[PDB]
């Protein structure tokens, strides 16, 4: 048995074809982000849009080279 | 002139085929039988020991006939199999 | 072409004419727009058609007005389609939509309370940044030493990626001190005051960390720097193309 | 170049029907002759863009069914109309012109879901573009459910008046000549699949021994409708067809070829083999592609069949060895548009053409030879026409070939095989006796 909550979403690929009986499935690589973000961040931004809010948090990151 | 060719087209008679395509397999088999019932005599003649001139004569005289019959069976069979002419 | 957002309450447009007139003298056709008076929104896209080629977001004070006018998910899609952007900020003006958009790019501005200050300064009254802090030659290269005037600026942290283009820096001594007991946003030379960004499609954003940089009352000290930064921002100073490979 | 002003349009009403995947313009004009020597000419003006793609241009009097000698010429461009009888210096005569373009409006949103309806955008000229001074003019659009404009003009006079089934325009009392300063752009609803055949080549194999004429066609089909956003997803497709939503969707699922009267031995083939989803009923061949052709997808396939030859040939009257053949020029899906047509007729091994006539002006005609099964010398005689712009159901003509086929070359076909068999036997003889 398979439940719809099992399979996680696919963030780096996007489906472009699948046969009548779902036998052969053809996916395509997504083009890398224009702004330089990791596509997982784009995914989490598009699936979690309204509730994912944080007031203020100083980001922790390495000193700019 | 398109008008006069189109006038001549309808006026004329239709096309009557030489040998209908429904009775060509019959001729195909009845010619396939004959074209081998004769071409075996050719090989028997050439194999048989006799005068060279007589062998040549009794080979070509009944080889031309087998040639014609095979060249007329290979059209009826080709039409009957679905690859016309 | 260019669109010009502003807010009369926070900062009147009458103190920015000198530069916008300089734009009107270079064939730019810019339509002014208010933030509250116009209840009807503005349309950047109609059926996948970019209307404007440039955007200038003068200081605002957050609110639901800006958030209605241009949300993040629309501004990203506009900037991605070769749309240049200029953007300003200050500890008196930190729009939430601007902050979230810049955070999505990689630039992190300061929050409302935090303000930069430097005790080692020739003029105590306001911030004077020396022309030795220029970090990128193609944007602006100082022919002669000068002093850019800033007032109540707000430095920004930068991530480590290949698109961000630091243009100015803050003096090493300076530091951001907030009213409350919050940790200093940026300490030392790690805090940048003017920061560009170049998309992979050759779109260009420029964030200026002070509302007092472009005011017409300051045009004797930082005239040429502003007139070159506004050229670089609108893709008309350093553009390269390869003809035959 | 401007034609000598000689006529005056005393009425000019034009109607454009956008209902069948190609613009079909119909202009009804009453015309008066300027007082001068009786002239017999007329120059209709097409824009240089539209004139590049026009596939049919007819013109006839309202009173008389018969047509005129309408012809195209060879930056406004012109088409020539010429009257049978010279018009009087001062006379009034009605006339009707029908043109069939090959350009349809581009999808406006361009990205629609597979269940939404698509809207198309078309750019034409509002004020009539004529080579003479026009007195009264009216414009009308028909054939769609809903019309809307796009960047409407401020002036009220230049604004369309909506109607229940049509979109008319107010008559203009005085229009000067060569006025093309207003580029109207209009969007309209349209749910057809917008087929387009980028390349068609159809072969017609005559054969007198078997007395059968067999057709073989190779379609390269492209859908021009709005592409689908978010990419393909079989789940949505197979969940929407189970509900009654397959009314007029804009993707191709089944094509309906219309063959001649009695066809046999139908086949439908693809580049990667045989397609099994075909169905041949009476006078209709239904075809299901491998995948549904959404917007922007290409499908290249082949379809063939066979007919009795007695319906297309006719032996002449004076002699029994002069034949006249009337080959149909197009029979495909109901409403497509062909961007190139290559019509090849393969007359038998020893034919010899005497006359060639076509009812639609072709671009190129040539004669070669091509060898086929049991063609042991010079093969068949191939006669190929090349047409450029053709419509599916209004470019209905018949190419008339007139050739001869003497019995001295009808019976050479068995003899040319008898020669090989006899040579092989006479070679085996020498090889075995030496
Ligand atoms: C050897 C004796 C048995 C031979 C069996 C052959 C019968 C089946 C052959 C057949 O099905 O033909 C298929 C195929 C059809 O050709 P098309 O590409 O469709 O022609 C285009 C015209 N529109 O024909 C061929 O490929 C070659 C067949 C020719 C051989 C026929 C010779 C018959 C015996 C002499
Ligand atoms: C709204 O805009 C007007 C523009 O003149 C300004 O004067 C006013 O202060 C603004 N009100 C706000 C931002 O609440
Ligand atoms: C017409 O077809 C012939 C035959 O191949 C070719 O030689 C000639 O160049 C063609 N002309 C045009 C204008 O297409």
Are the CB atoms for C211 and C92 separated by under 8 Å? yes
Return the DSSP state at D228: P
Q: Which helix (H) or strand (E) holds B31?
A: helix B24-47
Are the CB atoms for D397 and D329 separated by under 8 Å? yes
Phi-psi region of D379 (alpha: psi -120 to 50; beta: other; left: phi over 0): left
CA distance D107 to D98: 26
Question: Which tokens in the block code for residue D313?
Answer: 């040939």
What is the stated resolution of the deposited model, in angstroms? 3.5
Return the DSSP state at C45: B
**Cα D188 to averaged position of ligand 1 atoms, centre (Å):** 52
Which of D233, D238, D291 is closest, CB to CB, to A15?
A: D233
At residue D207, the 3 state secondary structure works out as coil
User: Determination method here?
Assistant: cryo-EM
Find the ligand nearest to C13 CA.
2
Number of the ligand 2 atom closest to the C-alpha atom of C65: 13
Q: Is the CB of D373 under 6 A from ligand 1?
A: yes
CA distance D253 to D275: 14
Gyration radius of chain C's alpha carbons: 18
Q: Of D299, D305, D300, D350, nearest to D328 (Cα)?
A: D305
Question: Which tokens in the block code for residue D1?
Answer: 């170049």
- Neighbours of D, requiring at least 3 CB pairs below 8 Å, are A, B, C
Ligand 2: which of C7, C58, C69 to mutate, judged by most atoms within 8 Å of the beta carbon? C7
Are the CB atoms for C198 and C138 separated by under 8 Å? no
Question: Which tokens in the block code for residue D205?
Answer: 């194999």
Which residues of B touch chain D, with CB atoms under 8 Å apart?
1-2, 5-6, 8-18, 20-21, 24, 39, 42, 46, 52, 55, 59-60, 63-64, 66-68, 70-72, 74-75, 78-79, 82-85
**Cα D364 to averaged position of ligand 3 atoms, centre (Å):** 6
Find the ligand nearest to D386 CA.
3
Which of D209, D313, D314 is closest, CB to CB, to B84?
A: D209
Gyration radius of chain A's alpha carbons: 17
Q: Quick one: how many helices (H) and strands (E) in chain B?
A: 3, 0
Length of chain B: 85
Question: Which tokens in the block code for residue D33?
Answer: 């002759």
Q: Which helix (H) or strand (E) holds C64?
A: helix C63-69
- Residue in B12, B28, B72 to test binding to D, most D beta-carbons within 10 Å: B12
Question: Which tokens in the block code for residue D12?
Answer: 């000019």
**Cα D207 to averaged position of ligand 3 atoms, centre (Å):** 27
Are the CB atoms for D147 and D160 separated by under 8 Å? yes
C-chain CB neighbours of D108 within 8 Å are: 47
CA distance D104 to D35: 41
CA distance A55 to A61: 18
């Amino acid at each position: 048995m398979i439940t719809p909550l099992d399979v996680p979403p696919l963030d780096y690929f996007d489906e472009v074809f699948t046969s009548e009986n779902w036998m052969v499935r053809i996916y395509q690589l997504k083009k890398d982000d224009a702004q330089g973000r990791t596509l997982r961040d784009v995914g989490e931004l598009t699936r979690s849009s309204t509730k994912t809010r944080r007031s203020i948090k100083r980001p922790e990151l390495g000193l700019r080279v | 002139t398109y008008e006069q060719l189109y006038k001549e087209f309808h006026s004329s008679k239709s096309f009557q085929p030489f040998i209908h395509l429904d009775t060509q397999p019959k001729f195909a088999i009845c010619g396939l039988i004959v074209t081998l019932a004769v071409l075996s005599s050719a090989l028997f003649a050439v194999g048989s020991k006799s005068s060279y001139i007589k062998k040549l004569f009794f080979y070509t005289i009944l080889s031309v006939i087998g040639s014609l019959f095979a060249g007329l069976t290979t059209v009826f069979a080709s039409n009957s199999f679905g690859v016309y002419v | 072409r260019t669109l010009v957002l502003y807010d009369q309450s926070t900062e009147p447009l009458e103190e920015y004419s000198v530069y916008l007139k300089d734009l009107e003298q270079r064939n730019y056709k810019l339509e002014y727009l208010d933030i509250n008076s116009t209840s009807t929104t503005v349309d950047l896209y109609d059926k996948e058609q970019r209307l404007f080629d440039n955007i200038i977001v003068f200081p605002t004070k957050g609110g639901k007005n800006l958030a209605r006018q241009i949300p993040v998910k629309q501004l990203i899609k506009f900037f991605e389609n070769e749309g240049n952007i200029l953007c300003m900020s200050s500890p008196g003006a930190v729009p939430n939509t601007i902050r979230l958009f810049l955070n999505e790019l990689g630039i992190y501005p300061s929050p409302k309370g935090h303000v930069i200050r430097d005790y080692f300064s020739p003029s105590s009254e306001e911030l004077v940044v020396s022309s030795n802090h220029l970090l990128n030659k193609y944007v602006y290269n100082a022919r002669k030493s000068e002093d850019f005037v800033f007032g109540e600026s707000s430095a920004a942290l930068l991530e480590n990626r290949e698109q961000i283009v630091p243009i100015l820096n803050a003096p090493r001594t300076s530091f951001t001190e907030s009213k409350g007991k919050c940790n200093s946003w940026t300490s030392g030379s790690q805090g940048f005051l003017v920061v560009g960004f170049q998309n992979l499609n050759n779109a260009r954003l420029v964030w200026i960390g002070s509302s007092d940089f472009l005011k017409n009352k300051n045009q004797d000290s930082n005239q040429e720097f502003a007139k070159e930064l506004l050229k670089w921002t609108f893709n008309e100073k350093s553009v390269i193309k390869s003809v035959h490979a | 170049y401007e034609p000598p002003a000689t006529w005056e349009n005393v009425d000019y009403k034009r109607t454009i029907d956008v209902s069948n995947a190609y613009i079909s313009e119909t202009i009804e004009i009453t015309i008066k002759n300027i007082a001068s020597e009786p002239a017999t000419e007329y120059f209709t003006a097409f824009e240089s863009g539209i004139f590049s793609k026009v596939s049919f241009f007819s013109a006839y009097f309202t009173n008389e069914a018969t047509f005129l000698n309408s012809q195209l010429l060879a930056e406004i461009r012109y088409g020539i109309i010429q009257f049978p009888n010279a018009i009087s210096p001062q006379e009034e005569v009605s006339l009707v012109i029908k043109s069939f373009y090959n350009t349809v409006g581009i999808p406006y949103p361009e990205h629609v879901g597979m269940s939404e309806e698509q809207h198309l955008l078309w750019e034409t000229n509002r004020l009539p573009l004529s080579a003479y001074d026009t007195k009264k003019a009216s414009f009308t659009l028909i054939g769609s459910s809903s019309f809307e404009e796009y960047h409407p003009p401020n002036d009220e006079s230049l604004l369309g008046k909506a109607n229940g089934n049509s979109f008319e325009f107010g008559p203009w009392e005085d229009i000067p000549r060569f006025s093309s300063n207003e580029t109207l752009a209009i969007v309209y609803s349209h749910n057809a699949p917008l087929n387009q055949v980028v390349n068609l080549r159809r072969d017609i194999w005559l054969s007198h021994w078997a007395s059968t004429i067999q057709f073989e066609e190779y379609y390269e089909l492209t859908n021009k409708a709005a592409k689908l956003s978010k990419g393909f997803s079989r789940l949505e497709l197979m969940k929407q067809i189970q509900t009654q939503n397959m009314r007029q969707t804009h993707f191709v699922t089944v094509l309906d070829m219309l063959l001649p009267e009695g066809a046999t031995d139908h086949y439908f083939t693809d580049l990667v083999g045989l397609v099994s989803t075909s169905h041949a009923e009476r006078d209709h061949f239904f075809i299901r592609p491998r995948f549904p052709i959404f917007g922007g997808w290409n499908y290249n396939f082949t379809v063939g069949w066979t007919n009795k030859l007695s319906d297309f040939l006719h032996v002449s009257s004076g002699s029994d060895e002069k034949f006249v053949a009337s080959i149909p020029i197009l029979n495909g899906p109901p409403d497509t548009v062909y961007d190139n047509v290559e019509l090849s007729v393969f007359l038998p091994e020893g034919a010899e053409i005497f006359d060639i006539d076509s009812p639609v002006p072709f671009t190129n005609v040539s004669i070669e030879t091509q060898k086929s099964y049991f063609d042991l010398n010079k093969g068949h005689v191939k006669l190929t026409f090349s047409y450029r712009n053709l419509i599916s159901q209004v470019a209905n003509g018949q190419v008339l070939i007139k050739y001869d086929y003497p019995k001295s070359s009808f019976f050479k076909k068995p003899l040319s095989i008898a020669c090989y068999i006899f040579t092989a036997l006479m070679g085996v003889f020498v090889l075995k006796t030496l």
